[PDB]
Design a protein around this nucleic acid. Structure first.
Length: 747
DNA sequence: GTACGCAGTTCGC
């Protein structure tokens, strides 16, 4: 099983290193024959002699094209003839590619921004994490005395805890008598002992939580000032710190540094992403937070250091357990994308689709288009189109509801109608499909690049779902469930890709055609069920709707829907099909995107209401949840009223716990690009002045204190809140938080 | 930083 791959340099030549694990043994395979390359579209083949003689001078060494090779590829389905230009080293590619482009005989270059390691895995057909190997994992965390804005690595690390499946220990240079605490003499010996532990355990995966931007980086900085060789790699090497724009990333050669933080942000929606919120989300019980204000007073006084030693041990153990749950899912994603677990776990959906498309492009001799230049990127950002159909719901309570949704509407449309930039308005075909309203035509004579890819994807999902039915191993069934679910997410994101401004295969006309077809298909089904089958559709959004027959009994509502399923699915073309979501006793549709609906087993499903939003305080969510749980399940408005009158009196009496009053809002940009101040924006400026890290994506936790005027003039971060000196704005959380949320349901 | 559709709160003016 392939874990990772990079390249070293030997006698000036690159040698790919394939880090493997076979039969429980670490191995490293070496490939010395692979070379970097770009593609060049030449005006005349005769100009290749002048193009070879294009030279650059990097590192004081004259760099040149080492091999020119003319190849025939397809560019948006059309055969193209380009020159494959090879270089000696991947590092001199960025220095010479601009001069190759600048040649007047070169129309353009292609595939010039693909890293050497990822180029190798693609061109060789190598899929990481494929195989039957159990990976050994070790989690670790550190406890420091670092201050916000206090450089980085200047404060000493106090504690280093680690945890695997066999133990969880704390290493420290402070006298603590706990049986899991190993007291060393110096901070240096604490770090060195940690290095031996990792070396002795030799784990395939090092698990951290936010280790890319703190724990690992701080460890490297402390080892720098203290003069310690931070040897962690299986090749005797130090972890490497790279930059990802607003973010840093730490890589440990020979192992996989699995930072859980970028994975949780992209997999789970949470109000905040502290290790304790995460723990309380995936696992049942909570965690006993230990704040940096206590860790300083615990060193100073020396007392209570047992507590922080326990919290350091709990962080490591919780990090390991969360890692053991999320690593299998991310392993399946790396297999699907075909890139390393290290890179897959830290990249966005758009980047995962790019790597997948680039691989599939290689398999089909499809030359990849370049990412847009500045003007084109901006043009794509300034461009939009119409999307899904959202029916204004029949607002109120309704009884006896059936839900019918399309199966992968986007991918079904793209495959059925061959929606692809290589088929759009393609000339000379015998068969065409025309997108409604927008009128774009798509050639059906030959499979387009993307539609053919989606067909293989939806195929593969059926093959995985089939095995998942007829397999015994509950772990294997789960791993397969990960795969088929990942295939569905990957496929369904392909519609929006066509409108992604950074996409190589960007096609606004294609994206326009998917939504236009989807709008036609849903409105046609909604009309058919209301015409021929006497149904009344209540709520409808994009690919699905909620319908019923007024007055009809619960059973005949079901049996008449199944009747409509076989009717509409016959006339439906291609892979377009309607499925049966489920029957639900009652359902209140407050407004567009805002509804809730109760199944037969008395478990409410909630969508769009303030209950699920993170920018609403828990006191408002809980009350709305309890209020909605009344009218939906117990139908009691009088109780619902007693709940509102209840929670208002606790707030006015200042008895509701302040933690139920924090609002979680995200910073989405540089604080200076904001053209309108808000509560969370003003709190962010205070933290920015305090030295606190303030970047796009930082969740702001703040409370509104009592007073009058701008909410932002009365808002402070929660870590600055103190009931002994602060008084919270109860009136605000009554009039602007609790009362508006409960009003929507009662109205 | 896959897309657009959409509700609802804060704030300037």
């Amino acid at each position: 099983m392939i874990l990772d791959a990079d390249y070293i340099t030997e006698d000036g030549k690159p040698i790919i290193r394939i880090f493997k694990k076979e039969n429980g043994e670490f191995k490293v395979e070496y490939d010395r024959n692979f070379r970097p390359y770009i593609y060049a579209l030449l005006k005349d083949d005769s100009a290749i002699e002048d193009v070879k003689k294009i030279t650059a001078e990097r590192h004081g060494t004259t760099v040149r094209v080492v091999r020119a090779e003319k190849v025939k590829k397809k560019f948006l389905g059309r055969p193209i003839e380009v020159w494959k230009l090879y270089f000696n080293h991947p590092q001199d590619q960025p220095a010479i590619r601009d001069r190759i482009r600048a040649h007047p005989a070169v129309v353009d270059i292609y595939e010039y921004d693909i890293p050497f390691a990822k180029r190798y895995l693609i061109d060789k057909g190598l899929i990481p994490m494929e195989g039957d190997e159990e990976l050994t994992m070790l989690a670790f965390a550190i406890a420091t005395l670092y201050h916000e804005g206090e450089e980085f690595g200047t404060g000493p690390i106090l504690m280093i805890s680690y945890a695997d499946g066999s133990e969880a220990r704390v290493i420290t240079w402070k006298k603590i008598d706990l049986p899991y605490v190993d007291v060393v003499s110096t901070e240096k010996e604490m770090i060195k002992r940690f290095l031996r532990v990792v070396r002795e355990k030799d784990p395939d995966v090092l698990i951290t939580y936010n280790g890319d931007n703190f724990d690992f980086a701080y460890l490297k900085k402390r080892c720098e000032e203290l003069g310690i060789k931070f040897t962690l790699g299986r090749d005797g090497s130090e972890p490497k710190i790279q930059r990802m724009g607003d973010r840093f990333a730490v890589e440990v050669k020979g192992r996989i540094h699995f930072d859980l933080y970028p994975v949780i942000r992209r997999t789970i929606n949470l109000p905040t992403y502290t290790l304790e919120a995460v723990y309380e989300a995936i696992f049942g019980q909570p965690k006993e937070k230990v704040y940096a204000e206590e860790i300083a007073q615990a060193w100073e006084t020396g007392e209570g250091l047992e507590r922080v030693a326990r919290y350091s041990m709990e962080d490591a153990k919780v990090t390991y357990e969360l890692g053991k749950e999320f690593l299998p899912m991310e392993a399946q994603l790396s297999r699907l994308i075909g890139q390393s677990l290290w890179d897959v776990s830290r990249s966005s959906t758009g980047n995962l689709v790019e790597w997948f498309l680039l691989r599939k492009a290689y398999e089909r001799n499809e030359l990849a288009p370049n990412k847009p230049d500045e003007r084109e990127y901006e043009r794509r950002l300034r461009e939009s189109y119409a999307g899904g159909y959202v029916k204004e719901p029949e607002k109120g309570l309704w009884e006896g509801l059936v839900s019918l949704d399309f199966r992968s509407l986007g991918p079904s449309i793209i495959i059925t109608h061959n929606v692809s930039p290589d088929t759009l308005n393609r000339e000379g075909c015998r068969e065409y499909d025309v997108a409604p309203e927008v009128g774009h035509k798509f050639c059906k004579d030959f499979p387009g690049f993307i539609p053919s890819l989606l067909g293989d994807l939806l195929e593969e999902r059926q093959k995985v779902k089939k095995k998942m039915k007829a397999t015994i191993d509950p772990i294997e069934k789960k791993l397969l469930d990960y795969r088929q679910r990942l295939i569905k997410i990957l496929a369904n994101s392909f519609y929006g890709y066509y409108g992604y401004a950074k996409a190589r295969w960007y096609c606004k006309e294609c994206a326009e055609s998917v939504t236009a077809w989807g709008r036609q298909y849903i409105e046609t089904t909604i009309r058919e069920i209301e015409e021929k089958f006497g149904f009344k559709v209540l709520y409808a959004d994009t690919d699905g709707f909620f319908a019923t027959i007024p007055g009809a009994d619960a059973e005949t509502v079901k049996k008449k829907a199944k009747e409509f399923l076989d009717y509409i699915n016959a006339k439906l073309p291609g892979l377009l099909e309607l499925e049966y979501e489920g029957f639900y006793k009652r359902g209140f549709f407050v407004t567009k995107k805002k509804y809730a609906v109760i199944d037969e087993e008395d478990k409410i499903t909630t969508r769009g209401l303030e209950i699920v939003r993170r920018d609403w305080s828990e006191i408002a969510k809980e009350t709305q949840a309890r209020v909605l749980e009344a009218i939906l399940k117990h139908g009691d408005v009088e109780e619902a009223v007693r709940i509102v009158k209840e929670v208002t009196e606790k707030l006015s009496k200042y008895e509701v716990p302040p933690e139920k009053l924090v609002i979680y809002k995200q910073i989405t940009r540089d604080l200076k690009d904001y053209k309108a101040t808000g509560p969370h924006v003003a709190v962010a400026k205070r933290l920015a002045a305090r030295g606190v890290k303030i970047r796009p994506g930082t969740v702001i936790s703040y409370i509104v204190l009592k007073g009058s005027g701008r909410i932002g003039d009365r808002a402070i971060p929660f870590d600055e809140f103190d009931p002994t000196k602060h008084k919270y704005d109860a009136e605000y959380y009554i009039e602007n938080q609790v009362l508006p949320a409960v009003e929507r349901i009662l109205r």
